[PDB]
Design a protein around this ligand. Structure first.
Ligand SMILES: *[C@@](O)(c1nc2ccccc2s1)[C@H](C[C@@H]1CCNC1=O)NC(=O)[C@@H]1[C@@H]2[C@H](CN1C(=O)c1cc3c(OC)cccc3[nH]1)C2(C)C
Ligand SMILES: *[C@@](O)(c1nc2ccccc2s1)[C@H](C[C@@H]1CCNC1=O)NC(=O)[C@@H]1[C@@H]2[C@H](CN1C(=O)c1cc3c(OC)cccc3[nH]1)C2(C)C
Lengths: 306, 301
């Protein structure tokens, strides 16, 4: 029993974190095999943050202009290349701690663990979801660039995020491990803003299924809804549209609890109109949207507390 | 910017988890130097635990009754003993991944990272606080016993918790790594109720400071209070007493924001008496009490 924001054990990622220095700029790098991945703006100085031409800044660098440190050991850079907004530094030593890994680009609503790092040293681990507006609500300070997000389903590390910037709203933006940004953001200091954010409807429903699995049913009602009527109502509260794909994904949780998906949608509609009336759901007084259906199945018992 | 519930990186502890089996009972163990630490009830069969006589059940067992597995390798048990509610198993191989560590017993209100494990394998990590009623609001299923709680400080892992049980309310209970229970609990198959829980006042104040540092100021006011007046309202709302030591600990956060501890206490006194009026603080409609003043400083710096 219980339900918490649960991150993956971070050991497999900790053994990949390095420090990358170019000039007076220092950030984190990810050392996998003989390659170090880091944000390409490690090659930027104060005067080229608004409109840097990364191709022109990089051609002026040699391999020995990059200082890579793994703990107290200096790694020698023997090659380099830029791929989108990521710099790939080839080093003379393959990381002996390289885990089984893959690079995946995630969709909005998906969650992952973030290992926040400063100067190549891990500081903490927390969970976060890719918001519908392609930002994440993280906890990142100066020098956190190059920190990565990942999942570790079945002993394979899936890297899905690399940290690059903080927007004026206090939310965060970054790229996948191929250097392609999530959303319309750019690695420039130009005026950028996150679009209006929405609630991840399929995740709220998954978390309501988690509450039922853990023994709470106070919020259910005698009603049902069509998918059309549910979307007409939920969008008036700034909820993301629920698709037939989301209904299908919720199938296993619906089967375990005996609560039809559209019946849980009717519960959600009533929760939006009434509030909780002094009650909590899984310890929360608001509707939580950063647990996916897969996260619920991972953490919850396969037996409902009937 | 941003404020999240954060756990310590768990790599140093992951390299210490093993599986321990005695008969048909399998649970997790912690392998440090040449010893494996696990809950003593690994020697109980599902019948023996209604009222176990651990002294007698241990006397019946020998080294051959224990099976320790580190990944795919089997460790040979060459000694055994009980210390309080933990079983200590001496093995023939010292763990080469043993970090610099110490066993520490935490106080209520203090926080720690839990590495939830099943069959000796780390499954997840989350942060939790030792409640004033000595329970933790964890997330544990069948097979989680032996999972440990810890804090990290300059390469040194301070182990503070070992998981043993779930109470009827769904909250969890355990021991320090010397086998001493936190709270009035016993390792027996009986429904045990924890005392009425109370809110950790100093942590709520720390989190209100974290909110101010992140731009949330609506709850700030012109008023100030004293300890004795604040403690009278704390008592009424089932909040733990605020002491001068707590005021001293909050001192750095107090100077950094320009809000004295007793000025922030007047904001908390107002939130308890009047509510939040539809507003949220740091994305929460509740007053969060599982962030210590150190968690706030560590994260914000
Ligand atoms: C990162 O760790 C980097 N720091 C530097 C320093 C020099 C060169 C390159 C880099 S990458 C930070 C992480 C940030 C800092 C606070 N919290 C974070 O998440 N990333 C940045 O500083 C990025 C890089 C330029 C600008 N930037 C911003 O986050 C940024 C600038 C900015 C302005 O500028 C006027 C106004 C408002 C908000 C804002 N954010 C890059 C995008 C290349
Ligand atoms: C743990 O992993 C153990 N499992 C076994 C199995 C055989 C022998 C020893 C152990 S330790 C679990 C973890 C629990 C289970 C669900 N989530 C958890 O956190 N611990 C237990 O099962 C403990 C051990 C006996 C009973 N117990 C309970 O949690 C327990 C019993 C109980 C009753 O009994 C009537 C009523 C209500 C609640 C309740 N919880 C020990 C305390 C020794």
């Amino acid at each position: 029993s219980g339900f918490r924001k649960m991150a993956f054990p971070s050991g497999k990622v900790e053994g990949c974190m390095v420090q990358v220095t170019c000039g007076t700029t220092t950030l984190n790098g990810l050392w996998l095999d003989d390659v170090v991945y880091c944000p390409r703006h490690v090659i930027c100085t104060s005067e080229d943050m608004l409109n840097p031409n990364y191709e022109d800044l990089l051609i002026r660098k040699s391999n020995h202009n990059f200082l890579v440190q793994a703990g107290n050991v200096q790694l020698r850079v023997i090659g380099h290349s830029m791929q989108n907004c990521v710099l790939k530094l080839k080093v003379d030593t393959a990381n002996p701690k390289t885990p089984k890994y893959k690079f995946v680009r995630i969709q909005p609503g998906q969650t992952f663990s973030v290992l926040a790092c400063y100067n190549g040293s891990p500081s903490g681990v927390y969970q976060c979801a890719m918001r519908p507006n392609f930002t994440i609500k993280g906890s990142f300070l100066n020098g956190s660039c190059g920190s990565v997000g990942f999942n570790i389903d079945y002993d394979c590390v899936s890297f899905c995020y690399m940290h690059h910037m903080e927007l004026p709203t206090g939310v965060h933006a970054g790229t996948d491990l191929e250097g392609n940004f999530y959303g319309p953001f750019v690695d420039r200091q130009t005026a950028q803003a996150a679009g209006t954010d929405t609630t991840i409807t399929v995740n709220v429903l998954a978390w309501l299924y988690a509450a039922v699995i853990n023994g709470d049913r106070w919020f259910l009602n005698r009603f049902t809804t069509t998918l059309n009527d549910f979307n007409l109502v939920a969008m008036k509260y700034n909820y993301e549209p629920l698709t037939q794909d989301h209904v299908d994904i919720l199938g296993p949780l619906s089967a375990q609890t005996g609560i039809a998906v559209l019946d849980m949608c009717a519960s959600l509609k009533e929760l939006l109109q009434n509030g909780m009336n002094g009650r909590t759901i899984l310890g929360s007084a608001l509707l939580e949207d950063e647990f996916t259906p897969f996260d619920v199945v991972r953490q919850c018992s396969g037996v409902t507390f009937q």
